[PDB]
Amino acid sequence: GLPVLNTPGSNQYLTADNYQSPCAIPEFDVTPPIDIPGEVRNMMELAEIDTMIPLNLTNQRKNTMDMYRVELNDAAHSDTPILCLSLSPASDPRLAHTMLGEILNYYTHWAGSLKFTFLFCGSMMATGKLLVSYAPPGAEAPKSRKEAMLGTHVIWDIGLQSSCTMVVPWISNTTYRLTINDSFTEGGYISMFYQTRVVVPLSTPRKMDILGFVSACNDFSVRLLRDTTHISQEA
Amino acid sequence: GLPVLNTPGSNQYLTADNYQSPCAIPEFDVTPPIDIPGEVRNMMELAEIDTMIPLNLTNQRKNTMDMYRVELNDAAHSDTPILCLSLSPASDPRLAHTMLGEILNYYTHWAGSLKFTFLFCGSMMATGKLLVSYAPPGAEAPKSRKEAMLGTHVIWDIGLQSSCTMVVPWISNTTYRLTINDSFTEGGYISMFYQTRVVVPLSTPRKMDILGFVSACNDFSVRLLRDTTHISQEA
Amino acid sequence: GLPVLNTPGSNQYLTADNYQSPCAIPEFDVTPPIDIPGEVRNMMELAEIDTMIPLNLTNQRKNTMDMYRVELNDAAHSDTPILCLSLSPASDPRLAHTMLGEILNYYTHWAGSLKFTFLFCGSMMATGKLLVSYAPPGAEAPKSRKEAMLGTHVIWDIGLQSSCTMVVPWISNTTYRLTINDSFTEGGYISMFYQTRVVVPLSTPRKMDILGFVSACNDFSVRLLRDTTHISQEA
Amino acid sequence: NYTTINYYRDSASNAADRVMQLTLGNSTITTQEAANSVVAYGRWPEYIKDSEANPVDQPTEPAVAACRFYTLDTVTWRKESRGWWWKLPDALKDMGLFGQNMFYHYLGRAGYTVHVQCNASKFHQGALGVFAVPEMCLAGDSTTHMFTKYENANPGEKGGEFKGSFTLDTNATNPARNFCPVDYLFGSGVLAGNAFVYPHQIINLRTNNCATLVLPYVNSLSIDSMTKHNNWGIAILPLAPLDFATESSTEIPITLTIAPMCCEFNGLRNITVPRTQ
Amino acid sequence: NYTTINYYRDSASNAADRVMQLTLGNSTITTQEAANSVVAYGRWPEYIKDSEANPVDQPTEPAVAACRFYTLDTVTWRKESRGWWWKLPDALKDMGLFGQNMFYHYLGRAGYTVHVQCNASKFHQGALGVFAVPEMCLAGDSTTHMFTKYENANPGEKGGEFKGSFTLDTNATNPARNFCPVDYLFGSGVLAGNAFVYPHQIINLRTNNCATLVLPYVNSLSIDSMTKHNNWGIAILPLAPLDFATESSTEIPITLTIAPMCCEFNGLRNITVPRTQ
Amino acid sequence: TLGNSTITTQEAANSVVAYGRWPEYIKDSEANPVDQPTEPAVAACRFYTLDTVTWRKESRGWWWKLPDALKDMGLFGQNMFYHYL
Amino acid sequence: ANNLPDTQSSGPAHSKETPALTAVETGATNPLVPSDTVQTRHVIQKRTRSESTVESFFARGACVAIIEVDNDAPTKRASKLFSIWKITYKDTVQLRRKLEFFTYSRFDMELTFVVTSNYTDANNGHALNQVYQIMYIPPGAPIPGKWNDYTWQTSSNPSLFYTYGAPPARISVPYVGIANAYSHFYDGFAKVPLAGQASTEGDSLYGAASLNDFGSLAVRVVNDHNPTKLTSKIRVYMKPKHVRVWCPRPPRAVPYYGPGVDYKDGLAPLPEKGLTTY
Numbered sequence A, B, C: 001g002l003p004v005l006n007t008p009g010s011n012q013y014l015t016a017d018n019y020q021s022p023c024a025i026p027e028f029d030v031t032p033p034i035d036i037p038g039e040v041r042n043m044m045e046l047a048e049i050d051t052m053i054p055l056n057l058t059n060q061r062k063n064t065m066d067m068y069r070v071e072l073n074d075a076a077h078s079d080t081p082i083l084c085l086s087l088s089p090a091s092d093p094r095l096a097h098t099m100l101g102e103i104l105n106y107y108t109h110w111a112g113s114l115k116f117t118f119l120f121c122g123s124m125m126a127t128g129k130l131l132v133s134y135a136p137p138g139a140e141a142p143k144s145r146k147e148a149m150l151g152t153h154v155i156w157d158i159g160l161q162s163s164c165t166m167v168v169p170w171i172s173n174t175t176y177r178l179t180i181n182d183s184f185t186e187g188g189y190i191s192m193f194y195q196t197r198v199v200v201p202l203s204t205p206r207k208m209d210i211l212g213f214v215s216a217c218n219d220f221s222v223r224l225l226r227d228t229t230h231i232s233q234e235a
Numbered sequence D, E: 001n002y003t004t005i006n007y008y009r010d011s012a013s014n015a016a017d018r019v020m021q022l023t024l025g026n027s028t029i030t031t032q033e034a035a036n037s038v039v040a041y042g043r044w045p046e047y048i049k050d051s052e053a054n055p056v057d058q059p060t061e062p063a064v065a066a067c068r069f070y071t072l073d074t075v076t077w078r079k080e081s082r083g084w085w086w087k088l089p090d091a092l093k094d095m096g097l098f099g100q101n102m103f104y105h106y107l108g109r110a111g112y113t114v115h116v117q118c119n120a121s122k123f124h125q126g127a128l129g130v131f132a133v134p135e136m137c138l139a140g141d142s143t144t145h146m147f148t149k150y151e152n153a154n155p156g157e158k159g160g161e162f163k164g165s166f167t168l169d170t171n172a173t174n175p176a177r178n179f180c181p182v183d184y185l186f187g188s189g190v191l192a193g194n195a196f197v198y199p200h201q202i203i204n205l206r207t208n209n210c211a212t213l214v215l216p217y218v219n220s221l222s223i224d225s226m227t228k229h230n231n232w233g234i235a236i237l238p239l240a241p242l243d244f245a246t247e248s249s250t251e252i253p254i255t256l257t258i259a260p261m262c263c264e265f266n267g268l269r270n271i272t273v274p275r276t277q
Numbered sequence F: 001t002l003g004n005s006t007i008t009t010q011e012a013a014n015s016v017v018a019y020g021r022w023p024e025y026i027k028d029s030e031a032n033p034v035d036q037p038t039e040p041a042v043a044a045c046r047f048y049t050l051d052t053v054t055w056r057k058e059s060r061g062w063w064w065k066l067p068d069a070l071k072d073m074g075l076f077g078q079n080m081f082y083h084y085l
Numbered sequence G: 001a002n003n004l005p006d007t008q009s010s011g012p013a014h015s016k017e018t019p020a021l022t023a024v025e026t027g028a029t030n031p032l033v034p035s036d037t038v039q040t041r042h043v044i045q046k047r048t049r050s051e052s053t054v055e056s057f058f059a060r061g062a063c064v065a066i067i068e069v070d071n072d073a074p075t076k077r078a079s080k081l082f083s084i085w086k087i088t089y090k091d092t093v094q095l096r097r098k099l100e101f102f103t104y105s106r107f108d109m110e111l112t113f114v115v116t117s118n119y120t121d122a123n124n125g126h127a128l129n130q131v132y133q134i135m136y137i138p139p140g141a142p143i144p145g146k147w148n149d150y151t152w153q154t155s156s157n158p159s160l161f162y163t164y165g166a167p168p169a170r171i172s173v174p175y176v177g178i179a180n181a182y183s184h185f186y187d188g189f190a191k192v193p194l195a196g197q198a199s200t201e202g203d204s205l206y207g208a209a210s211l212n213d214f215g216s217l218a219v220r221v222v223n224d225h226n227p228t229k230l231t232s233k234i235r236v237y238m239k240p241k242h243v244r245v246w247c248p249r250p251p252r253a254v255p256y257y258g259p260g261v262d263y264k265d266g267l268a269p270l271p272e273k274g275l276t277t278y
């Protein structure tokens, strides 16, 4: 019939191809869809939902419910950090297993601003000011509030509103970052410090907890879908 | 389905083919380009940049910085050549490793006019006249200025302007020349002679250096891309 | 992708096919053509050029320059033929190696009128009349002028014009003839006779030579290109 | 004619002159024996455009505080000099408020005006090639690949010198971990004579006393870390050796004056204190 | 009908009479017994057009100084003559200012007017085929392929003679390295009777005394080296042997007069002095 | 520039045209010979360099005769000796 | 890519304009043409720079990796049942040099896989046609430790299943750089060592960054082992497509020594030739 020439790539199976195939059940009467609540079109919609960060991965806290709580107290003011995180949303252990991290571990490249939301879970009678800081990479990781205040930061006043959002802006040399611990595409450093201190009256718990959440911003995106390392099979 | 016939050449891989293939990372969000300075569209743009010629490939000068300098002196006038080159921009050792030669060694055929630029690097107090000659092939290579002046040539006066350009015109029987030492497509002979001589006053260096550069003209072109012999790998 | 069906003839190589193939030297700057004299579009253009016939293939004349000359003399009139040829332009030894024969030996079928041109190379003082005859096949090959004059023929007067053309017309049962010695497609018989005789005065050479040439007419054509038997290779 | 149809979504799947004055901030340079001035790739330095801004936080633009000429340490040109190299912004890390902004921010971007000065009499000889090389990577001195340490790769305003011949560092206990830039290989395994593909100027002592190169910010990113990455490399090579009146032992100074241009910094934090040599 | 669509960029990938007077310069030829004149391939010689000029330097066109008839050495036609050959421009390398321009320039181009003259009485017999062969390559005389040396391949105005039979040069110590052109093989492994595919004229002594061939410049290049490459070859063969009145020992001269036409030369240098036989 | 020859000068004292008359070809109103002339043009109308002389303190001067000084110079001398005029 | 300019006729010249004399000190290449220095005729140019375009220059499949795998048995410790290859163009020189003509590049890529297999011994029987799995492992994704561990489910990792004897497999990739262009050269470090910390910490390889981190390819034979060992090799051919390049550099003149610009051997690339020898 029609003269044809078989190019290279013939008879190959590429799992990413997009080709028409014969139907094995022709004329099947497909059940129509109903309007089910909660439809999702993009994985970034899930990445945009705040999920609690397992911040406290110490030996006795990891793999319990205590790994999500960070304990503050009413001690005297100090410049040492409350918590320190590395901005590796996919490879950092404290971030890898959040929903954002879980989605990023199916992709190779990511880019966009993040939001960290901290919720104060002390009593109504507790007051304080915290400093949540993001340092772009390149310099030494801030070991005191004096270093941390030189980077991006927010001073959080704990009052009638017990939650504060810090947006980590997209500050990268490359247009995309890798989802692995990588020096050339390192993200930066999140840290928390006491601004003044936590003050409580008498007959109040002197130790309280903060909970951490992370999510993506509307400018976030990923690409180069890959296989995750968070699931494996034996034999 | 549609009757088809498989022509010869089916299931072959030609490294020069141009075929559509399935994407292995569908829906990837590609990082947009920024305006980076120094974009290149054609290799002939690079071939059009003057590059220093390793003219002096003697035993003690080759593979040093001295191989680029040609030493003139204030001796008495002589008709012997200062330097002699063979117009084989890809196969001639003194030309093969210039940028023009490097680009030509990725191609089989070339055609067009060349420009040789000579820079005088003596003192301001030095004066002289040189004769830069191109002889199309066929006759004996000019061994004296008397023979050289019968071909294409330029008389260069060394004064306030220390650089002179000689254009070697495209004079070839074939529409293209080969990039190898080849008799039927031989290029010709470049030579330099003293026109009068180099004259210096007292308290001035009596020996000076000229530097040679080569580049292509806007009528230059290559074709039949091939693998170069200037890079090789072991084991 | 698109459902396709591989017809028979897929993955075959036919040396006569006409298919597109990938270019191994993409973007090559092809040297433009110049107007070269003597362009040929059809092999029949070459077949239409008169070429000398090796008429005299005797033992001592073949494979010398004498094989092209046919010797006439001033003897008394005779009805025996001067020369006899078989109209097999490709298989006849005297015709096979003419340019017409050489071209026909690359083809299987041929059809059209031929022209035989005879040039008289005696002295100006020689006079005579010859009879050049073509007999279509079927009857006995003419052994005397009396038989030959019953077929197609021309009476050639040797005077101020020393050349005569006889057109062998296309007289064939089949629309094409084969290029081999074949009975069903046999061509006929060319012959030459003395009409009166060759007369010379005294002090003139009594033996002269005629040269034979053959060519095709503008109605000539060939077909079914094949491999010739006039060239072969060893080992 | 031929027909082309794409059967896939992603497009990846588809088939294939002499008198000049330069004023920046409170600094001014006058030249009378200049060989014009080169703008690298014909692109003038500029600020990041909103269409190409990766970082979201407001940049700081010190302008005249940092966009001004700083003069580096003078080097000496002798008959035996093989050449010198500097890295930008590394050569300016200890230069006024420019270095302060460089070390207080995570991201920095700047173009440059490089002015090389080398005056000699009318009885001197010699030529200097001054080359601006983007991503001027230099070869190390050990069998270990890419083994040069940060301290040596960032010498500062002194820069480094090219070498006549390659020497291998065999000290296993205390490796030098320094560069070994060979002058005729341009320090990167490429013939120096081809280095003219880079933006450049030649100071021929008979013609000009100075060279000026306007380097735009060149990088695969709109803005990067200045402490990690050196955008440019300034390489000076003697093309023609220095000579003078046969007296010998002559040496003339070469001075380098670099002005950063269109400085932008992002990611303010505590200052970076890099480890010293 | 059928449909064709090209799926590639490069088009290579796509599917498949008697009284005459000739005046050139200060030379004139009159003929009364001419068999007309042949223009090879119907193309008159011409100068290079700007649309086809490869060399860029201004050509020199000596015009009448070189575009004029030069007469070569006369040869003798006997009963035993097998034929003669000449190479153009080789046959004119020692002819006035034409040869001077030929040897002073690297590139040369010229057409020709070849006039072969052979007068005999009305009681003579014989025919001469005069053939203009582009790229008239001739076979050598040794088992070594392509072994003919330059000196023999360029005999000059004397040319060479064809041979009745092929002789092999077995002298290993001092090989002749000369041509061995066999007359019936036309000197190139092709039957002489087919040589009429080339532009030609026959001098039949009963009809005409002369032949005229106007050869255009024919080559795969617009202009070439005249010292390296012979554009044309003039071959004269006795088609009919010479005979006269049975006296025997008769011999008549054949004279060759060639005028180069539309001479263009490029690449002036010192003169070329080729090695002599 | 004449033919394939070119001369560049930077320290010239201008150039003199003798009697203010530029060289020209014979006009039909002044042609004595009737036969067609030959004009080699670039083949002969080009610069030929003579032997260099040396200027010393004791030099008294030199003289040349034209066209005599060019009788052995390329195709100019050839045309000179092949023609009567 | 487009047609070259024509050559205009030039006659004799006598003027104060001197295109030949210039000053290379400016760093500018003199844009002379033949008509400036010699008399020229008119030539209607028909040559073109179509094959000199950056697209044509890189429009070839260049081998960049030869990955060796085996199908012998799990017990055999000398047979590598799967092979992981870091994705890079620096394992081969020819494409590396052509690319390092430029500082920056940006292009889509076409990967072609040519698989050749053979027997290693004769007296152990024969084998059935093999299927190869080539799994792309982007950085951060789990890396197979065994030829048959869970990682080869490829629920998210792109994977190519090639049947032996079929035409070479082929995939296309968009520009997947996290920067706006690929960096052939990176004059810097991934870490800046900070004053105070030990010399062990902060030390990073020169010129190495995550710009060139693209993950790896894990190649295995999906078939179970036949009683005889079969050795296979996958050859990876990389073809840049839609190429843009920036900042041309002189090409590599001496042999490559490692992933960086280091040189150790063959530092004398130029031969010896007389100054006045043609």
Ligand SMILES: CCCCCCCCCCCCC/C=C/[C@H](O)[C@H](N)CO
Binding pocket: B024, G087, G088, G089, G099, G105, G109, G111, G134, G135, G136, G158, G159, G160, G171, G173, G176, G182, G212, G214, G217, G238
């Ligand atoms: C389908 C599974 C196996 C095949 C898929 C492998 C995809 C890997 C493609 C992305 C990584 C390579 C991208 C380009 C490589 C280098 O960066 C360029 N040569 C840089 O010049």
